[PDB]
């Protein structure tokens, strides 16, 4: 919910710096990812409604124990709000931030063998919307810069024409590029249209609307932080600053 | 519910007005205990009945 | 006020740390209490009800 | 030797392993409590000739004000309850309800998620196996009352071994004619019409004389821990409703005539102590489902 | 060939055509509501050591104060409730209650009288026909749980046809031993203990191997629209009470073991959807009869 | 000639002769009333966030304020109620609780000790005897629904006599195939699927044709006077809990599948009317036992 609310590149990377990896990993068993299932949608149909479960749903799924599953759990958390079930990763890796895993070699995780095409296909890039594809491409660029695979990232964009048009423009080592970026990455937000307490047909759409309706409740909740009215009560370390720089950028 | 609270508040006031009218139902000894904190006799009895 | 400290000293303390400091000194009021929702209805009369 | 077993005890399909934590248990209890308010408000609306009590309760249940020309189905709460019910039944059923939705709905009303406050009695008769000699025929019918028909065509009397399992508390055996039954390696008693048995005592031997068939009627009672809000009549009505609507139509699952059969069958399978916990939550969910649909019907 | 049919499905007698209008439906709903208050007031009177709660409930129900030297009969409301129950069962019943009397009794309380606000599940299993070839014997026993016992005497396996009607929603078949069942013009599956069936999906063929008898246990569930105040436990008690009191003793009628069998049998008769609405109102009246007579025995 | 009889009707054991006075009947009535409030206070406590409704209910029942780190057995009322249930079942069971203790617990609430104001319907089928000729086999299975399977291997048709006793009010007979039944020394009517009989009319004769076996399913309804608080659902649950908790385990007693079988068997014994009176008091005590034990599981 909090990760889906971020609407700018600066906010997204700032959230990932303060968020540990354990938030990406889920400890609920879930179900196997790719299955043709029948779900109940009584608002629309009397018969059961066919659908296919996927990894970018908002509900936890079972994940492979390899490094591929860990990266695929991080991206699903960013684009869908929930991760997958990969237990016994370890204290050392789980305490690191999401940005450290994606960008830093000191974590101890080796990810240079990853194939962006296979990861995108397993995440069902075809079913993703524009904001979801932009968020995943941000994760790919950070991984490419960590492994020195910038050339491979560009070629993968050349093969996929729709991905090249929406590819965010920022150098993963320079903070000046992040501040200038004006891409809108928000998935949930205050809706200008009429939003009703009604169900959706597919699993992805229904789960997304739950976060959208939950965010509205979160926005008016006491947990939400109102910068306009309570800026002085925020701690100085985590207070918003114009000259905000990620470490090493 | 608002209806229950409104109904209870009005009925409570009606009973208190009637018990204290004419010769009060409760004695002066009880009123001394209820008014020891500075509240009025009618107010003290209304809280205790509640 | 109660633990004899200053704002700067307790600036970085979290809620649970602050609760422990006050509870040890003997102050029990360290919790927020949720309100109770009262259900309300307006009788229709000429207009539809709410 | 020939082996006969009860039909409903055969091959219990695995139950779901999701939505069994404290947060999900609170959501089911909240749904049951709110569904009961929904059915009582509809009665009050009938007696008062005013829709205010029903609109008042539907808003709490569905988080939406009822509008004409739109079908009343229960809102997002009905969607979560119906899909969670499917997951409890089978492990092949998908888990599609997010955790954010479960937490939000569980906060609507204050209630405990305790599922072990009270107990209930279930009357399904477990006959794990009946072993008979070559020249005899044994047939078992029924679940609430099991009639075992035995015919002996051999020259002499035969011994039939009865295994009632280890879970049931008491088993009462009534025969069409007086018959002899005793435990293993125990002298046979005089012929009697009725026997009260403890299934833990061991396998039981029945002497079947040559002649007219002997029919033994079996009744069993078992104790399972359930929440205080459990109502057997409401749970059974919801089980048939869920079957008619097709929520239990999943691949590679077994179908039962009653919730009593379903819970006993899962109890007698391996790791049945863990299965029975999930079944109890399903029963409470079916009680909420039964009250929700009876308040909001569809032709 | 031989044909086997359920005993309770045979020859449903015609039901009454009176006291089924809106005004009469409200009276039955009024009687049920006031009869329930009689039971509750008696419990309150016993606990409070005062007869005042019972006097109010009896006065509302019977339009007269209770008296120690007069038998507590329930007044004119009890007589009207008894007479309408007789009329609902058969068309040959007198149906002598005036419309002015019914209307005045429906004004004692305000109720909608709607008989379609909810639903109830009925468990009677309707086996309309079991068609068996030669050298095979088929027996059907029971209504709530139907046991079908089949013996194959001939040389080879026999095919047996099962017809469950077009009204029941679902039917579960369980066998003593694994057996094969499939629809018409469908391949037979591997033998298994339990089958779940939709009665609307045509007749079902059962393969009967030669040897020991095969017994099939059948359970069915049917949903019939009923008012929200419907309670199957109280309706069942009233049905048994009415038979013992002689309310159903009319010429040229059929008798059933339970209200479950009564409503399902009338449903399966030709043009049976006409009768099902009258049977539901009868069930509600029996629910009022049970509570009233338990509070005021005669 | 062969004789067949229902299993549950055979050899009813003597029932207890203690705790049947007016003061003892008040104690059972008090126990049922206070146990019902215990089960209702639990639901009200959960709806709110206060244990006050349960604390008040438990304090009245157990004469002691509930405390954490204690089992919450139920106090002296729970102990006294358990012992009287043992005494009712058999005359061999000792009577432990003194009359002074019973009177003290009866003063906690003001309720009438009358146990015969209302009535209830019991559906056990009392087939006392079925007399059959030499070449016929007769088998009786079941108590709630009694199925009699008869087969005739003789040359001609055989007459079978059915005796249903004199206590049952109505008996409904349903056959697998239409059959002929008539009273003693009476002409046989045309074959019919169903029969409604009054057992007091007399023994009945059924014609059994040569061929496939005929199965007759019997259902009965007997009315027994009970208190108004009587609930069949609660009584049956308490009966199972009573047997599971091992307080019916006494030397030289007969065991039953349900309370309904227990009460019909005693009604058909020698002193049927006197035996049933004690059993009704046992039924109310069992109803209180079920409600108390579900709230306080030990």
E140 at interface of F, judged by CB pairs closer than 8 A:
yes
Tokens of E37: 């208050």
What's the sign of the alpha-carbon dihedral E19, E22, E26, E29?
Answer: positive
Q: What is the 3-state secondary structure (H, E, C) of A223-239?
A: CCCCHHHHCCCCCCCCC
Give the span between the Cα atoms of D242 and D286, in whole angstroms. Answer: 8
Q: How many CA atoms lie within 13 A of E134 on its CB side?
A: 1
Quote the strand ranges of chain E, DSSP E.
Answer: 2-4, 118-122, 129-132, 136-141, 146-152, 158-163, 170-183, 192-197, 204-208, 214-226
Q: What are phi and psi of D241, to 5 degrees?
A: -65, -45
Residue whose tokens read 């009577």? F95
To which H or E segment does residue E43 belong?
helix E22-48
C12 at interface of A, judged by CB pairs closer than 8 A:
yes
Give the span between the Cα atoms of E213 and E226, in whole angstroms. Answer: 41
| Longest CA span, chain D | 78
CA-CA distances (angstroms) from residue D75 to A196, A228, D79?
10, 35, 7
Contact A124, A55 (CB under 8 A): yes
Give the span between the Cα atoms of A85 and A61, in whole angstroms. Answer: 6
Q: What are the chain F neighbours of E142 within 8 Å (beta carbons)?
A: 145, 147, 217
Give the span between the Cα atoms of E80 and E76, in whole angstroms. Answer: 6
Contact E207, E227 (CB under 8 A): no
Neighbours of F61 (CB within 10 A): 26
Question: F213: closest CA among E207, E24, D135, E139?
Answer: E139
- Specify the pairing of strand D204-208 against strand F158-163: unpaired
Least CB–CB distance from D98: residue in A31, A48, A210: A210
To which H or E segment does residue E212 belong?
none
Give the span between the Cα atoms of D263 and D143, in whole angstroms. Answer: 12
Tokens of F225: 């006077």
Give exposure, D27-45, as e/b (b: 16+ Cβ within 10 Å).
bbbbbbbbbbbbbbbbbeb
* Distance linking the first and last C-alpha atoms of chain F: 53
Contact E150, E132 (CB under 8 A): yes
Smallest CA–CA distance, residue E223 to chain F, in Å, is 24
Q: Is C38–B5 a contact, with Cβ atoms under 8 angstroms apart?
A: yes
Q: What is the 3-state secondary structure (H, E, C) of chain D?
A: CEEECCCCCCCCCCCCCCCCCHHHHHHHHHHHHHHHHHHHHHHHHHHHCCCHHHHHHHHHHHCCCCCCCCCCCCHHHHHHHHHHHHHHHCCCCCCCCCHHHHHHHHCCCCCCCCCCCEEEEECCCCCCEEEECCCEEEEEECCCCEEEEEEECCCCCEEEEEECCCCCCEEEEEEEEEEEEEECCCCCCCCEEEEEECHHHCCEEEEECCCCCEEEEEEEEEEEEECCCCCHHHHHHHHHHHHHHCCCCCCCCCCCCCHHHHHHHHHHCCCHHHHHHHHHHHHHHHHHHHHHHHHCCCC
Three-state DSSP class for residue E87 = helix
Give the span between the Cα atoms of A233 and A240, in whole angstroms. Answer: 12
Residue whose tokens read 């995108």? A120
Three-state DSSP class for residue F51 = coil
Give the span between the Cα atoms of A48 and A42, in whole angstroms. Answer: 8
Give the span between the Cα atoms of D261 and D124, in whole angstroms. Answer: 6
Tokens of D211: 């002649």
CA-CA distances (angstroms) from residue A176 to A173, A180, A243, A249?
9, 6, 10, 9
Contact E138, E251 (CB under 8 A): no
Q: How many CA atoms lie within 13 A of F2 on its CB side?
A: 16
Burial of F153 per CB tally in 10 Å (0-12, 13-18, 19+): exposed
To which H or E segment does residue F17 belong?
none
Give the span between the Cα atoms of E293 and E81, in whole angstroms. Answer: 11
Q: For chain D, list the contacting chains (3+ Cβ pairs, <8 Å).
A: A, C, E, F
Q: What is the CA radius of gyration of chain B?
A: 12
Contact D78, D94 (CB under 8 A): no
- Specify the pairing of strand E2-4 against strand F2-4: unpaired
Q: What is the 3-state secondary structure (H, E, C) of chain A?
A: CHHHHCCCHHHHHHHHHHCEHHHCCCCCCCECCCCEEEECCCCCCCCCEEEECCCCCCCCEECCCCHHHHHHHHHHHHHHCCCEECCCCCHHHHCCEHHHHHHCHHHCCCCCCCCHHHHHHHCCCCCCCHHHHHHHHHHHHHHHHHHCCHHHHHHHHHHCHHHHHCCCCCCCCCHHHHHHCCCCCCCCCCCCCCCCCCCCCCHHHHHHHHHHHHHHHHHHCCCCCCHHHHCCCCCCCCCCCCCCCCCCC
Burial of B29 per CB tally in 10 Å (0-12, 13-18, 19+): exposed
Neighbours of F108 (CB within 10 A): 17
Q: What are the chain E neighbours of D8 within 8 Å (beta carbons)?
A: 174, 194
* Cα angle: F278, vertex F282, F283; to 5 degrees: 120
Which residues, in sequence order, are CB contacts of E74 under 8 Å at separation 6+? E61, E62, E81, E292, E296
Q: Is D254–E215 a contact, with Cβ atoms under 8 angstroms apart?
A: no
User: Can you say how many angstroms the Cα of residue E33 is from the centroid of all Cα atoms in its chain?
Assistant: 21
Give the span between the Cα atoms of F177 and F212, in whole angstroms. Answer: 10
Tell me the β-bridge partners of D183.
Answer: D204
Q: Is D100–A48 a contact, with Cβ atoms under 8 angstroms apart?
A: no
- Determination method here? cryo-EM
Give the span between the Cα atoms of A72 and A83, in whole angstroms. Answer: 8
Contact E120, E233 (CB under 8 A): no
| Longest CA span, chain C | 62
Residue whose tokens read 């006065």? E59
Q: Is C38–B3 a contact, with Cβ atoms under 8 angstroms apart?
A: no
Tokens of D179: 């018959």
Tokens of F169: 């009010």
The region, left, alpha or beta by phi > 0 then psi within -120 to 50, assigned to residue A19 is: beta
CA-CA distances (angstroms) from residue D88 to A43, A172, A222, F132?
22, 46, 35, 53
Q: What are the chain E neighbours of F228 within 8 Å (beta carbons)?
A: 39, 42-43, 46, 294-295
CA-CA distances (angstroms) from residue A221 to A225, C14, F46?
9, 20, 27
Tokens of A15: 């959230």
Q: What is the 3-state secondary structure (H, E, C) of chain C?
A: CCCCCCCCCCCCCCHHHHHHHHHHHCCCCCCCCCCCCCCCCCCCCCCCCC
Neighbours of E267 (CB within 10 A): 22
User: Can you say how many angstroms the Cα of residue F265 is from the centroid of all Cα atoms in its chain?
Assistant: 9
Neighbours of C50 (CB within 10 A): 11
Smallest CA–CA distance, residue F51 to chain E, in Å, is 23
Smallest CA–CA distance, residue D16 to chain E, in Å, is 21
Q: Is E119–D297 a contact, with Cβ atoms under 8 angstroms apart?
A: yes
Tell me the β-bridge partners of E202.
Answer: none
Give the span between the Cα atoms of A116 and A139, in whole angstroms. Answer: 10
CA-CA distances (angstroms) from residue F185 to A92, A171, D25, F195, F198?
97, 109, 67, 18, 17
Q: Which residue of D has its CA nearest to C43?
A: D52
What is the experimental resolution, given in Å to one decimal place? 5.7
Q: What are the chain B neighbours of C38 within 8 Å (beta carbons)?
A: 1-2, 5
Burial of A91 per CB tally in 10 Å (0-12, 13-18, 19+): exposed
Which one-letter DSSP state was computed for residue E14? P
Give exposure, C9-36, as e/b (b: 16+ Cβ within 10 Å).
eeeeeeeeeeeebeeeeeeeeeeeeeee
Which residues, in sequence order, are CB contacts of D65 under 8 Å at separation 6+? D55, D59
Burial of F82 per CB tally in 10 Å (0-12, 13-18, 19+): buried
To which H or E segment does residue F126 belong?
none
User: Can you say how many angstroms the Cα of residue E145 is from the centroid of all Cα atoms in its chain?
Assistant: 15
- Specify the pairing of strand A61-62 against strand A84-85: parallel
A-interface mutation test, from D14, D75, D95, D250, most A Cβ less than 10 A away:
D95
Dihedral angle at the C-alpha atoms of E165, E166, E171, E177, nearest 10 degrees? 40
Q: What are phi and psi of F199, to 5 degrees?
A: -60, -25
To which H or E segment does residue F224 belong?
strand F214-226
Least CB–CB distance from D83: residue in A39, A46, A196: A39
Three-state DSSP class for residue E25 = helix
Give the span between the Cα atoms of D200 and A201, in whole angstroms. Answer: 51
Return the residues preceding each gap in chain C, C–N over 2.5 A, or none. Answer: none
Question: A114: closest CA among A179, A155, A66, A43?
Answer: A66
Q: Is F119–E233 a contact, with Cβ atoms under 8 angstroms apart?
A: no
Dihedral angle at the C-alpha atoms of D117, D121, D122, D126, nearest 10 degrees? 110
Three-state DSSP class for residue E261 = helix
């Amino acid at each position: 919910m909090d990760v889906l609310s971020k609407g700018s590149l600066k906010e997204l990377l700032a959230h990932l710096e303060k968020t540990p990896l354990e938030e990406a990993i889920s400890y609920r068993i879930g179900t196997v990812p790719y299955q043709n299932v029948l779900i109940s949608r009584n608002e629309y149909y009397n018969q059961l409604y066919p659908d296919t479960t996927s990894l970018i749903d908002g509900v936890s799924r079972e994940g492979q124990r390899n490094v591929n599953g860990l990266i695929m759990s991080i991206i699903s958390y960013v684009v869908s709000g929930s991760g997958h079930y990969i237990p016994n990763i370890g204290f050392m890796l789980l305490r690191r931030s999401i940005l450290d895993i994606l960008t830093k070699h000191d974590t101890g995780l080796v990810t240079n063998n990853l194939n962006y095409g296979i990861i995108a296909r397993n995440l069902t890039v075809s079913k993703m919307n524009c904001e979801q594809r932009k968020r995943m491409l941000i994760c790919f660029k950070l991984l490419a810069y960590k492994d020195g695979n910038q050339n491979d990232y560009e070629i993968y964009l050349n093969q996929n024409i729709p991905l090249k048009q929406i590819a965010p423009n920022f150098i993963p080592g320079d903070m000046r590029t992040v501040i200038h970026n004006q891409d809108q990455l928000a998935i949930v937000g205050i809706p200008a249209y009429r939003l009703t307490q009604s169900t959706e047909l597919s699993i992805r759409d229904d789960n997304a609307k739950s976060y959208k309706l939950g965010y509205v409740d979160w926005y008016n909740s006491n947990s939400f932080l109102r910068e306009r009215s309570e800026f002085n009560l925020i701690r100085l370390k985590d207070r918003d600053t114009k000259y905000g720089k990620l470490n090493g950028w | 519910t608002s209806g229950s609270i409104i109904n209870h508040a009005n009925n409570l006031n009606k009973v208190i007005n009637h018990v204290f009218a004419d010769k009060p139902l409760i004695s002066e000894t009880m009123l001394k205990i209820l008014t020891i904190d500075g509240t009025t006799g009618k107010d003290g009895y209304r809280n205790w009945l509640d | 006020f109660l633990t004899n400290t200053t704002y700067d000293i307790v600036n970085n303390d979290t809620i649970d740390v602050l609760k422990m400091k006050l509870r040890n000194q003997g102050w029990p009021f360290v919790e927020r209490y949720n309100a109770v929702e009262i259900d309300m209805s307006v009788e229709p009369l000429r207009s539809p009800g709410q | 030797a020939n082996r006969a077993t009860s039909a409903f005890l055969d091959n219990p399909h695995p139950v779901g392993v999701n939505y069994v934590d404290e947060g999900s248990r609170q959501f089911v209890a909240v749904a049951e409590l709110l569904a009961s308010k929904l059915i009582d408000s509809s009665r009050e609306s009938d007696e008062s000739n005013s829709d205010v009590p029903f609109v008042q309760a539907y808003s709490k249940f569905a988080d939406d004000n009822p509008r004409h020309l739109r079908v009343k189905t229960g809102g997002k709460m009905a969607n979560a309850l119906t899909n969670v019910i499917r997951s409890y039944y089978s492990i092949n059923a998908p888990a599609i309800v997010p955790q954010v939705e479960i937490d939000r709905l569980a906060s609507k009303a204050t209630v405990s998620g305790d599922m072990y406050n009270s107990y209930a009695i279930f009357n399904s008769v477990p006959i794990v196996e009946v072993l008979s000699p070559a020249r005899t025929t044994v047939s078992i019918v029924g679940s609430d009352r099991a009639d075992v028909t035995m015919l002996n065509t051999g020259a002499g009397a035969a011994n039939i071994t009865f295994n009632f399992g280890q879970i049931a508390e008491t088993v009462i055996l009534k025969g069409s004619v007086p018959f002899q039954l005793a435990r293993l390696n125990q002298p046979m008693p005089a012929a009697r019409f009725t026997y009260k048995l403890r299934p833990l005592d061991g396998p039981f031997i029945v002497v079947l004389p040559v002649g007219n068939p002997l029919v033994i009627s079996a009744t069993a009672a078992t104790r399972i821990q359930v929440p205080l809000a459990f109502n057997k009549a409401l749970v059974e009505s919801g089980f048939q409703t869920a079957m008619n609507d097709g929520l239990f139509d999943i691949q590679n699952v077994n179908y039962y005539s009653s919730f009593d059969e379903f819970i006993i069958s899962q109890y007698h399978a391996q790791d049945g102590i863990n299965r029975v916990s999930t079944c109890v939550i399903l029963g409470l969910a079916l009680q909420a489902y039964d009250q929700m649909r009876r308040a909001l019907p569809v032709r």
